[PDB]
Design a protein around this ligand. Structure first.
Ligand code: NA
Ligand code: NA
Ligand code: NA
Ligand code: NA
Ligand code: ZN
Ligand code: ZN
Ligand code: ZN
Ligand code: ZN
Ligand code: ZN
Ligand code: ZN
Ligand code: ZN
Ligand code: ZN
Lengths: 333, 333, 333, 333
């Protein structure tokens, strides 16, 4: 099913308590949503499907190019599909900067607020406010008001301090975050504290992650809140998960990462069999030498099924890397 | 917008009165729905989006493989998208044989009946009962009861007499159809009377259409109903529209075809630029010689945008071939 | 075997007498020479292999880029190969303009003159002087001296009046040609009289051949020589044979074409299976996703055999189009 | 130039004295010969071009399939080309087993014997007798008689003890070899003593070379001949050079390898740009959607130039790996 707000909060609480995380898979279409959910199910895992501003625009079609329309249309599709799977699927929106709040996150929040006010559940279960490009005090001022609105609509807010490339979060930024927002008692929030994360996939030695930054952030927060030195007040989000080393993922989990974003690696997994299909069927997908091609290989389903299955396999890998495989809160073993 | 039942009936009535038709485009995904609607809009045309049993299964994902789920999920997606376009978009389900009625058309009819009963409109605006594989009397017995159910849910029923290859309808089949169902006064129905139609795309000289069969059917019905010899009591559906000659389409329109199904040709249009993208970007969509590929070309949006635009262009062509271009009932000129 | 000068003159005389012609296939390599000769043999035909200035440069390798070296090296290769086939194979050099005579045709003539002077046969059996870019009187002045040199080395000279595109020869050019060179009694020559010929392959309606120009040339020559009106004093060469219509080839044969040059069409035939091989074996000819490819498909012989066989088939087609198939002067039936 | 017998013996003597080796590149065509020689020249190196039984068959064309014809034709081509380069190029024939001696090595030896007897030099400068599949005494009986014949024709004989995969030579095989053949004073020979060599290219950890076997062989021979313990009486040949580690090549050189065979790696280098050309020019090398392709990209020279240049680069790499780069005996610096 779609995760209810209660189930999603329980998911994140269980992940945090047990030092595992969920994949948050960027999707752009019916096929990619289907691939992501089948991946979670095949892994016996709960999971998160997320739409970026660009993914939502793409989802709305070239004739519309509207983020809200694409996100709503894909979310409505996902609600129907997720009802047919035993695992819990949460819907999220990815990076929304200041100049897009009025045309993405705010209108979507309003849609969920009206669903709530009629006794229903929100359309999305979390939204990202990415204020990393503005000064920390402005970022957290916007965050504080968005958190109030999100919590009232039964929605978790993700925020970002530090910039994701494709830098490293400061100790005072961690302190300000706890001061402005508390530690969940004013509404749950997820913190994308950057620690050398880069969007994309590069050769080894390029990306230089420093997970100790997350460890330091937990200690700074714990001290601020008068908690024991081993407390983990933040629920962290790991951006740019694709291409990461196993050892890097493990250390991040130990310091309270509960959500790792995946996009590039699932993109490659989706496209790879499509590429192979076109080459081995070159004289079927092209009308060559006066021939009329071969419908059974230019039928989009023929290669998109393969794309879907391949992307699902990569999502299974993500669930095993993040140690959420076999841990769905529905307990279908 | 999505066509209301009233708008759809007006669409079909206007097409019939003016000897034009609408394309009915088989879709399987968010991208193909988007491509079809943008095609209608670019042509200033109303149009029909249809889901086959296989398309619906595909739409539901490999983890579900359920026709109702796929059709509902894609229909809900389409409702959100179509609201953002000035033209009217009707939703239809394609060939449903006897052994699939209980798992496709009937449950979908029930969903729409419950929407109606609450003061709303049906989810789909037409459904196809394909009884061509059973004897004519059984076909029309099922048709009569389905027509009553469809009409009560504000839905138009498409039926088929004769088999689509990939044969030719008999005069007594036309007579029985009018006798069993009337001429619209017991609920509007569309008649796929086959006249040599074949699903697929072949070289010229293979497919042998006989449009005079449709002309004969109108005359047989007109005589049965005591109407003038030039009356056209049937609203015909032209299956297997892809690969057809212009001259063949024109003659069919003259005899009362109001809906022409397109699938194969839009499949080729969708896939063609994807094939081209994979070849010209071979070293970006594949990780070759120890390199890591190029994310900006293995991002599914990069080639799927091209696929969408190409399929839209083919849909524009269909609207101009069928003479519905520039005739949308919203009159946005 | 390689055609002796006596056999080559007999070949051309027989073709002329019987209104057929030989293909002259442009070759650039051991593989293409092999493909051309196997084509002649499979057709039971004699034939001509020709090297252009660019083909000879290519044959000499990127480290040399010398026309004489490439032509000699490929000719020596061809002498060994042709000895193993029952049919007669003549060697020719293609278009040599004024500024390349000193670095192509003249040095090659000198090589053959020294072979002759020792009691052997020439290395090449014909050479082309292409003087079409200079005024007719200069063209024929050079032709007259080259003809004397060629004949003394047992070599036939091909000349060109009119330009091949990628225009139409004048009546006075035909008259001057007979006046300057005679009709074979001062040494045999072949005349590339252009009649709308274009190098390359285009869609129909582009290239506009006028074979009546050749008919007029024969009549002009016949009148000059005091011969009957149906005499054919010229042995014509048809440049740009690829892409030509059957009807066009037939008319040209009737007017005395004895040699038709083929290049573009044999190029496509050679490359086509190589293209197919790369696509269907994409993951064998490329090291993909950390794999090491597949030696049995990146072995050049694997696709070059296919290229060779395909080009041979196109050469067989040329022999049947030109009506030299089954007519080799060795009579191996 | 082509290596004279005197120059080739000097080449091998210099390599041995200075612990370097020459690449022996398997070639099959005018293009691959051209690529190999340009590689040697670009490296300022002497080198060896070799034809296998299969390469020679391929060189003779599908219409002939005769090893002697292909080897002679390619050798004659190579004689013309090599005269235009400052470096010395030796011609060799690769593995010839017992049942092919009468149809490859023996007839080629006879051709060279007749050239010698007229005061010329041999066509090939070395021939391989591969008797590894027969018992050692039979192998060396055949070797002894072939060595006498080869030496009399100014040709060096390569022999093989041990089998190349795609095993390890025994101490008594080394002893028998010196006893039967001496150490050069009855004619120079090259010894392919196998030490775990495999033809082909595999992932690391598969091929398990044991160069100490060569070291042991030199010591066994030195003791037999009453030479100092550090003497190297054998000139070794390293089969299956492609895919080898640098460290492995270095150790083999120290123990007296003077010739390393390369085939698989130059095959990949040749094919790789052809593959790339076909993909990026897919709509030029194929006639697609009613178009006629693009002659400038289906011209075989367009991709074969790229193939030639790429293979030359790999040959340069081989000269630097084997430490013969910059050491050509013509001293063109
Ligand atoms: Na990344
Ligand atoms: Na069709
Ligand atoms: Na042409
Ligand atoms: Na190897
Ligand atoms: Zn991110
Ligand atoms: Zn459990
Ligand atoms: Zn149909
Ligand atoms: Zn209007
Ligand atoms: Zn020409
Ligand atoms: Zn005969
Ligand atoms: Zn070997
Ligand atoms: Zn030097």
């Amino acid at each position: 099913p779609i995760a209810t707000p209660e189930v999603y909060a329980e998911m994140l609480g269980q992940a945090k308590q047990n030092s595992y995380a969920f994949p948050a898979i960027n999707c752009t279409s019916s096929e990619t949503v289907n691939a992501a959910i089948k991946g979670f199910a095949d892994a016996g895992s709960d999971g998160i499907i997320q739409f970026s501003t660009g993914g939502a625009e793409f989802g709305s079609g070239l004739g519309v190019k509207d983020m809200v329309t694409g996100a709503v249309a894909l979310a409505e599709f996902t609600h129907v599909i997720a009802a047919k799977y035993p695992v819990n699927v949460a819907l999220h929106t990815d990076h929304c900067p200041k100049d897009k709040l009025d045309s993405y996150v705010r209108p979507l929040l309003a849609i969920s607020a009206q669903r709530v006010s009629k006794g229903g559940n929100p359309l999305f279960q979390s939204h990202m406010w990415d204020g990393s490009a503005v000064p920390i005090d402005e970022n957290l001022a916007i965050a504080q008001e968005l958190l109030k609105a999100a919590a009232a609509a039964k929605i978790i807010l993700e925020i970002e301090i530090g910039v994701v490339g494709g830098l490293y979060t400061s100790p005072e930024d961690f302190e300000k975050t706890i001061e402005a927002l508390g530690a969940g008692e004013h509404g749950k929030y997820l913190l994308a504290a950057t620690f050398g994360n880069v969007h994309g996939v590069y050769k080894p030695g390029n990306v230089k992650l420093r997970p100790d930054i997350l460890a330091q952030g937990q200690q700074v927060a714990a001290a601020k809140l008068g908690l024991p030195a081993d407390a983990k007040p933040f629920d962290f989000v790991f951006h740019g998960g694709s291409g990461s080393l196993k050892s890097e993922i493990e250390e991040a989990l130990r310091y309270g990462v509960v959500k790792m974003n995946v996009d590039t690696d699932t993109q490659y997994a989706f496209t790879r069999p499509i590429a192979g299909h076109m080459f081995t069927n070159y004289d079927g997908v092209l009308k060559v030498d006066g021939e009329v091609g071969v419908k059974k290989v230019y039928d989009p389903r023929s290669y998109l099924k393969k794309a879907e299955a391949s992307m699902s396999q990569r999502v299974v890998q993500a669930c095993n890397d993040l140690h959420c495989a076999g841990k769905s809160l529905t307990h279908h073993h």
